[PDB]
Design a protein around this ligand. Structure first.
Ligand code: HEM
Ligand code: HEM
Ligand code: HEM
Ligand SMILES: [Ca+2]
Ligand SMILES: [Ca+2]
Ligand SMILES: [Ca+2]
Ligand SMILES: [Ca+2]
Ligand SMILES: [Ca+2]
Ligand SMILES: [Ca+2]
Ligand SMILES: [Ca+2]
Ligand SMILES: [Ca+2]
Lengths: 674, 319, 671
């Protein structure tokens, strides 16, 4: 364990105060047995003081999230492109901590809200902590950091009543998107399956901004970070995400925790697109613009190394709640660009940590400490944990022999700003006209989705915009959507009873780009960790025998099996009362249980509804045992449908079923606009 | 009202800093049109500093809740039982503010979690602010305040993974309940429909503790506070409440906001049960024990006044 | 020790950020060589952010202070009187940290203010940290903790202009004293030399309150803590203290630091008076009353152990500024009493540390950590430095097997309230009538001082009360003083041109008590560390020779010698320009320097003024090798005036003078 030095064991021993005096903490000290509590009860006050002070402010954004420890391993010595030490040798390993999150919701909001997601990675390198504070979507809503509070105020709950929680489905958000057209690209992403990923493990990570890789000789290249999931791309469907948000608000954090505990820690290839400084404006947009992607057709990915998360935190508050990332945590070999969104972020993280931590020594929390020595003249501050020996903490000095020494390009492996960087011109609060095309790339993204996928995106927009009360805002939203796609505007307008404006073809085109579609990304590369719900009954010993056999066959392949029946007993994990289709990636009914398809033990129709929901939401579903018509007919599920299975043979059933799990979603169950 | 004086109107005008200097806030100041951002950009830093510091710690318990302004009106001059000035004359009106809440969930969790609920009432009286910080259930889980962090750690999410949110449905909570039998009464209440009320307006409020009414002559009587809902008693069913948690996490706060905006502000009769000091142990239990109710058969309610909530906040955070 | 693990070495290495990235910190990153500074300069912002956030609130009181580390050693197994683990074996050693302080001044105010002084001692015991948060005066101004903000607002600067700093010499303070008669006892102590101690090492430590010693059998006795200085008792005189406040604001903290660095770390016998519970009102006053001492005639001292301070801090901010004492840091074998001053203190220290630290994990700071394992269910909070493995931090639990287990009188060496303690009666906001005598003990104290000592205390009151603008307050002050002593009232009234009220003999008496007088406590038991200024000249090679001969002798006897001359050179420590009589405990002029008694190198008459100030302030003074003594109007026959050609002889006599320390016959007395 990377933080073992800081762990406190309470598996033995007597209760003590924080200063080691043995005490009790179960009854207050009173003046008589039915008397008033005494002020001199220090046991009471120290315990309740601590409780009263347990909370710290949630993150201003990305308040809802979860983290894990792991390791990064480099695939090569990358000297040829960067001086970065963590990348300087094949097989070199660096500990990491990653936190994943939504953006809008507070603490305690649902994991399966539709939102942008954070993906923040710390590399505890041998030349300092390096943080990549990224998202699951490669482009951001706005083109200047100064706009962030406008965006976030608009998305977060209306400030008179604090409604609605963790949702863009309200007037203010769509007022802002329609007034600030830069938002279109990220908006289209958020309205796709990327807004409701199946898990943190099934999403990619992006730095969003263009950064620089800087060699020890001072030359630089432009880069984009892209962490490519080894688990596949996968989304929920919206109706499923809504039910999930109520049945399991902790869905993503539980999925990550469980995958790690089972030895299925998630992996990504840490990649970059690498281009020349001369290509800043060569691709038909400006690399300083965080609303644009570099299509892969123009710049392929270079795999730098492997990221694997394989260790859960010991204490969530101390590790996951207190981790404080900064894009300012940069190392020699990396530099910034003049992306005005990035530029302003550099200020915000350092300042906001004062808010959360309540004082300036937040880098001393165990989770934030580096894994190398610290030499500097930073002193004092509330919560100062060091005892500095150097009594002359100023530069230049002779009384400490000139130490610490200055580090720079030529000495001490100092960070240095890419020396080819320049600035010219007027000091201006002006937007570059190179940033002005807000619509072509949203259209590129949309064009690249499959037909059903395009339908899901249209449907997400229909859902949210139909909840906007202002007819003017709705009109304004159609005006912007229509600049990306007339057809999107027409289909969305249909649901809200307004007319779409006439086509405006300025930014329309037919181009597509690879690697942005979820539905088109093919079957999952692994089905380990995927969840199978076996619906059985205690009414028939035969049904539980079937479920035990099925369990064995499925578990051999690393699937997580839940057997559901009316009541618990050995071999049954979950009652119908607590079971839901959102708990599973595939659902199997054992034919011994066909009769179930009213009781005081579960809501009326529960067993059938689990099956029907799983089918409606695109999941593989099946009946095992040979007798299937009763169940399939009660569920209105066609026996010969794609992703519908019926076999007597457990082996055969499982072989076919596992293909369905990799396919993951049977999209021919969803209606399309004609 | 201290609040009228602090309302700020932004329906007109040019944007200013917090020190009244007119500014813009849409583009950062840069060294050239494609250049880096300048440290001298005070418009940027004041805006972003404020954003960076918007959040404050959520309440240690009852983090999820919603409030409204209203009035309390006394039905009589209650001098006969209490010196309390807000209760000293028929018709006397006192401004109030009430916040309703769940207990275990963080500030973004669902209103329809199964839980105890807070019902905290401030009376801004002519002799000082008086708060009755109560619940929708008349009895509490534990018999000594020193146990609170035990109960709350047990019911809040397990501290290695912070799972599960806003729920007693996990080992630690049931470990605590089964090890601490005082928990049984409140547990039974939370597992009834009182754990999943239909709205804040359809639940009652209780002080829980025995308090004292004290006359100007120094004499005292023992009292229980019970705010009786004029809307009636109603619950959700469990499956319904689970679905609502997903489809509308804001369900209770929206319900209250809407009732107020429509001129249907909710009402309670503020009542007490009143017994003599000599009855502290007369009913087969100790009135100092917050796990016990006084059955109405042993002590009827006296209606003191009318509490009505009829005005929503202007800014949720500030109020 | 928690502290060794947290020491950080910067004697080698390249500069890094706080996250270990090598950086520079001397030039801002700019858009061009004459260009504006960039927001992306993280090197600048992390450095400036830290600087901008260096300061923390000063202590609400006792903000000006200094600390050191040391050791406590028990003289015996004290089982027979207390269960306290640190007292349970002969020779048992416990690390300590002590901070000494004034009370009213802010953190940059002078050490030599006239004030009560704090003497706060932490014992890092093998059963928890135990703090005795005491003062250099055994009694306090007020009888109920709830009055503390009244006392402290009255003594601290007037709140419109924040004038005057670190002084009771203003109207509000004397308005409070004269309206709240409980203040008289501490006031008399503050107005004596106890208000201006010569150093932290020359003052005693007192717990003030009655506490309990509790045995493992549950029995208790009542105790007073008294730390008896092994360096002796000594004071400044007031004029010397005033000059010192300007010439060396750091005088006491420097004195302590130097004593430690020189292997002369200060010692105290840690003592108690011990009496039975039945004696709580047996001595003519109530032992719950913090305005009363137990005269030693009624209860002698038991020496429990030795306190020695012998190591300075490494980082003042991290150790001295951040140490957070609490009377709530109590251990098994000690209990509280129902002293209403002590009772409220218990709440204050815990709460105020939230203010200073800015979050609840202040016991995690290295200086506040214990030296034993911590097992509890305290969690989270800002600045949480632990990673707790127990994921069931509630009691009762089965999922962590019942741990941590409850500790109490019969398990786990738990703290327990003394079991014989009871309470009975109405719940009242009433002062016990047993607290009502505010004047007899102030009179006892005053009676116990030597005539010159009584003069000094009278002169302190004359000085301060003459600065009170309000005629009404001055009159009220005389009313109260007169209840203690009519003579004090008369003598103080004479300075302010008011008439004293007629004698009111209700509380007058002629009783005296041992151990409260400084002047009467005899010569100092050691003169090591005391300071000798040798006034010399570069004019005469012979002056320098004389000085160096004196130096050899005096340094072997543990004295700190400063040779002063017009300019620095080999063997000269200080210039006349920077020298002052307040820098010295004794002054010697070498024969060769007689000429100096105008130059661009020091102010006119500086050499003579040092000798004259030292004589006026009562110090041993001499000439080694007539004219100098004539120039200074100093009588050759005077007590503590030395005039010898023999160096050996001079040294022997002068060193007796240093032990006597002050020659009080140089001070005029009222007649
Ligand atoms: C490219 C666009 C951006 C991305 C990908 C991004 C990513 C993130 C992520 C992942 C987190 C959560 C880190 C964690 O898990 O603890 C975060 C937090 C935060 N972000 Fe950014 N963000 C971006 C833009 C901004 C901008 C423009 C600002 C302000 C000018 C900003 C201010 C914050 C603040 C104040 C926090 C809370 C940080 C803390 O308390 O530690 N974000 N952001
Ligand atoms: C009769 C049993 C109890 C009832 C009815 C009760 C009621 C409440 C209510 C209604 C709130 C929310 C007030 C608001 O809306 O802001 C609250 C908050 C709180 N409660 Fe209590 N509570 C009880 C027991 C306790 C105990 C025993 C403790 C501690 C020993 C305690 C500590 C707190 C704390 C620390 C908060 C947060 C207050 C704040 O941040 O303003 N509660 N409680
Ligand atoms: C017997 C009377 C008292 C004595 C001997 C005493 C002694 C002390 C000492 C020595 C300090 C400084 C500790 C240090 O060096 O850090 C101190 C600080 C303090 N005292 Fe007391 N005191 C007494 C009465 C009180 C009362 C009645 C209160 C309040 C009700 C009080 C509140 C404080 C506070 C708030 C501080 C600052 C503590 C900190 O910041 O850590 N004092 N006192
Ligand atoms: Ca809105
Ligand atoms: Ca540089
Ligand atoms: Ca649990
Ligand atoms: Ca019901
Ligand atoms: Ca009810
Ligand atoms: Ca004054
Ligand atoms: Ca004296
Ligand atoms: Ca024991």
């Amino acid at each position: 364990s990377p933080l073992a030095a800081y762990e406190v064991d309470d598996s033995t021993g007597y209760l003590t105060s924080d200063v080691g005096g043995p005490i009790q903490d179960q009854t207050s000290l009173k003046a008589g047995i039915r008397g008033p509590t005494l002020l001199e009860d220090f046991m009471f006050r120290q315990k309740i003081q601590h409780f009263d002070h347990e909370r710290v402010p949630e993150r201003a954004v990305n308040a809802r999230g979860a983290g894990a420890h792991g390791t990064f391993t480099s695939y090569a010595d990358w000297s040829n492109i960067t001086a970065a030490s963590f990348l300087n040798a094949t097989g070199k390993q660096t500990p990491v901590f990653v936190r994943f999150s939504t953006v809008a919701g507070s603490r305690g909001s649902a994991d399966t809200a539709r939102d942008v997601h954070g993906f923040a990675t710390r590399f505890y390198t041998d030349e300092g902590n390096f943080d990549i504070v990224g998202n699951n979507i490669p482009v951001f809503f706005i083109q200047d950091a100064i706009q962030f509070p406008d965006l976030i105020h608009s998305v977060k709950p209306r400030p008179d009543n604090e409604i609605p929680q963790a949702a863009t489905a309200h007037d203010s958000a769509w007022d802002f998107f329609s007034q600030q057209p830069s938002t279109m690209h990220t908006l289209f992403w958020a309205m796709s399956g990327h807004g409701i990923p199946r898990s943190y493990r099934h999403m990619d990570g992006f730095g969003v901004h263009t950064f620089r890789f800087v060699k020890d000789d001072g030359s630089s290249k432009l880069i984009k970070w892209h962490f490519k999931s080894r688990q596949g791309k996968a989304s929920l469907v919206w109706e499923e995400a809504q039910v999930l948000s109520g049945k399991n608000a902790d869905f993503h954090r539980q999925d990550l925790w469980d995958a790690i505990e089972s030895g299925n820690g998630p992996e990504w290839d840490v990649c970059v697109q690498i281009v020349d400084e001369s290509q800043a404006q060569a691709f038909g947009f400006d690399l300083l613009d965080p609303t644009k992607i570099i299509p892969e057709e123009y710049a392929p990915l270079t795999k730098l190394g492997l990221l694997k998360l394989d260790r859960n935190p010991t204490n969530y508050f101390a590790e996951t709640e207190q981790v404080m990332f900064q894009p300012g945590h940069i190392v020699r070999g990396i530099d910034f660009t003049e992306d005005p969104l990035l530029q302003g972020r550099l200020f915000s993280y350092l300042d906001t940590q004062l808010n959360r931590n309540g004082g300036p020594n937040f880098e001393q929390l165990p989770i934030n400490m580096p894994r190398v020595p610290i030499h500097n003249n930073n002193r004092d501050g509330a919560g100062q944990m060091f005892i500095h020996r150097n009594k002359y903490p100023y530069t230049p000095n002779t009384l400490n022999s000139g130490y610490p020494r200055q580090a720079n390009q030529n000495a001490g492996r100092g960070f240095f700003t890419a020396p080819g960087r320049t600035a010219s011109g007027a000091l201006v609060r002006e937007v570059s006209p190179t940033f002005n095309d807000h619509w072509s790339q949203p259209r590129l993204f949309f064009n690249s989705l499959t037909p059903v996928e395009q339908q899901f995106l249209v449907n997400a927009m229909r859902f949210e915009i139909s909840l906007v009360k202002s007819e003017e805002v709705k009109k304004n939203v159609l005006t912007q959507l229509n600049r990306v796609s007339h057809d999107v505007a027409v289909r969305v307008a249909a649901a809200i009873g307004l007319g779409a404006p006439d086509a405006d073809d300025t930014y329309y085109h037919n181009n597509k780009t690879a690697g942005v579609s979820i539905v088109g990304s093919g079957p999952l590369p692994t089905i380990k960790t995927l969840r199978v719900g076996i619906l059985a009954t205690t009414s028939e010993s035969s049904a539980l025998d079937q479920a035990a056999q099925l369990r064995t066959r499925l578990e051999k392949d690393g699937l997580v099996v839940t057997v559901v029946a009316e009541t618990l007993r050995e071999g049954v994990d979950q009652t119908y009362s607590t079971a839901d289709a959102t708990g599973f990636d595939g659902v199997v009914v054992v034919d011994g249980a066909a009769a179930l398809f009213s009781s005081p033990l579960f809501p009326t129709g529960r067993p059938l509804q689990i099956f029907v929901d799983a089918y409606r939401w695109g999941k593989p579903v099946g009946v095992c045992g040979g007798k299937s018509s009763e169940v399939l007919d009660a569920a209105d599920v066609p026996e010969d449908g794609d992703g519908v299975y019926s076999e007597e043979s457990v082996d055969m059933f499982v072989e076919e079923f596992e293909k369905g799990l990799a396919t993951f979603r049977f999209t021919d169950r969803f209606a399309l606009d004609s």
